[PDB]
């Protein structure tokens, strides 16, 4: 997927950045920008306004977990299929998430990285991240194929 150079670039960037609120912001934004995705998170409580969504503690906590999973992917870029095989089964077979949404979330994450990280998040670096999120989305969709 990534060249060695692209992997090194992604890895170095991910090493330095402070990301403990990024996951919650990405999930929050998904549910605000694409509100059908709220269907999947009824148990999370108040999602009735943009503000309610973004400040919902369950959204923040779940987003942290999602990013932790993404970071796992980042440590196994050679084996995204193996890494997400179980999560693919859960999301497709049990949660019934259409795979287009995996792409939407990867792209929201990129938007979030760009908002948080300014000029270091260059076009070259962002394109490297687009490969990573496309890889994670393909790996999650796998149980559909």
């Amino acid at each position: 997927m990534l060249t060695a150079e692209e992997k090194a670039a992604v890895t170095a960037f991910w090493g330095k950045v402070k990301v403990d609120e990024v996951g919650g912001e990405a999930l929050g934004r998904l549910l605000v920008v694409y509100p059908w995705t709220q269907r999947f998170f009824e148990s999370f409580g108040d999602l009735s306004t943009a503000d309610a969504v973004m400040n919902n503690p369950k959204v923040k906590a779940h987003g942290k977990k999602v990013l932790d999973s993404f970071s796992n992917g980042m440590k196994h870029l050679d084996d995204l299929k193996g890494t997400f095989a179980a999560l693919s089964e859960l999301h497709c077979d049990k949660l019934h998430v259409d795979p287009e949404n995996f792409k939407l979330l990867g792209n929201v994450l990129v938007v979030v990285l760009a908002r948080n990280f300014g000029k270091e998040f260059t076009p070259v670096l962002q394109a490297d991240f687009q490969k990573v999120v496309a890889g994670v989305a393909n790996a999650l969709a796998h149980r559909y194929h």
């Binding site: 929050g28 934004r29 605000v32 920008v33 990129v110 938007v111 760009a114 076009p123 687009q130």
Partner: protein, 141 residues
């Protein structure tokens, strides 16, 4: 369709873009070409290297079209009339590619206006760009 609130969000955000519209149009094109190499095949006549005069000049034209749209939020189909015929009939642009450029524009705006790019504003701009896209794909003839 854009709500009155969305149109407020769009106008306010574009106001914040200020004198940087052309610059951001160029960057969004560069991010599109780099992230989604398949879009480069629509510009085989361009030098697509970073900083090329052609991408710069095209960026400004894309930006100026978006500015025109921002000034015509009550009637996008009317405002984007000629560009719709051009993209659909002449250029036969695959509808997928509008989403790639739109995502590219959101990355660019987020990067440069991180304080103004709130979840509500993000959702408004995403609708605006999808709508513009819908219009530019509204008559393959």
């Amino acid at each position: 369709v854009l709500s009155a609130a969305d149109k407020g969000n769009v106008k306010a955000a574009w106001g914040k873009v200020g004198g940087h519209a052309a610059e951001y149009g160029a960057e969004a094109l560069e991010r599109m070409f780099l992230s989604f190499p398949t879009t480069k095949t629509y510009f085989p006549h361009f030098d697509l290297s970073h900083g090329s005069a052609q991408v710069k000049g095209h960026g400004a034209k894309v930006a100026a079209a978006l500015t025109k749209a921002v000034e015509h939020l009550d009637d996008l189909p009317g405002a984007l009339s000629e560009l719709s015929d051009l993209h659909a009939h002449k250029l036969r642009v695959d509808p997928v590619n509008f989403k790639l450029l739109s995502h590219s524009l959101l990355v660019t705006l987020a990067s440069h206006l991180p304080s103004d790019f709130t979840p509500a504003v993000h959702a408004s701009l995403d609708k605006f760009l999808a709508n513009v896209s819908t219009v530019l794909t509204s008559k393959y003839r």
